[PDB]
Amino acid sequence: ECASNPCLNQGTCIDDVAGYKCNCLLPYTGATCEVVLAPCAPSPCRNGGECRQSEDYESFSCVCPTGWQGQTCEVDINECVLSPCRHGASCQNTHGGYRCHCQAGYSGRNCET
Numbered sequence: 839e840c841a842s843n844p845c846l847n848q849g850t851c852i853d854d855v856a857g858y859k860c861n862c863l864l865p866y867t868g869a870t871c872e873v874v875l876a877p878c879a880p881s882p883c884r885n886g887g888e889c890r891q892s893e894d895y896e897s898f899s900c901v902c903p904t905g906w907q908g909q910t911c912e913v914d915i916n917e918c919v920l921s922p923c924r925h926g927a928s929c930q931n932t933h934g935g936y937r938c939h940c941q942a943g944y945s946g947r948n949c950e951t
């Protein structure tokens with residue numbers, strides 16, 4: 839049976855009494871190695887997170903952009919818990935960001951300049 843080279847994506851074939859079997863090369867899988875393990879294919883990350891597949895292709899992780907957290911980057915980070923706003927400025931936590939309201943004579947994103 840293996841003389842028909844049925845295993846795709848360069849998997850190796852083994853003749854057996856029941857039927858042949860394919861030893862597939864990750865990330866390929868399935869009866870004839872025709873399926874691709876692709877845990878990032880559904881685009882599971884949110885808010886611009888970068889999906890990264892595991893070494894065994896069974897799972898994913900998300901690398902979240904600044905201000906986001908959670909397994910899929912859906913959870914807001916509250917920068918105001920330890921406020922970065924300088925020179926007396928108030929901190930306002932927003933969805934996906936934060937705002938520093940500067941006291942007189944100060945400016946910049948963190949009221950640093």
Ligand SMILES: [Ba+2]
Nearest residue numbers: 915932934935
């Ligand atoms: Ba925020």
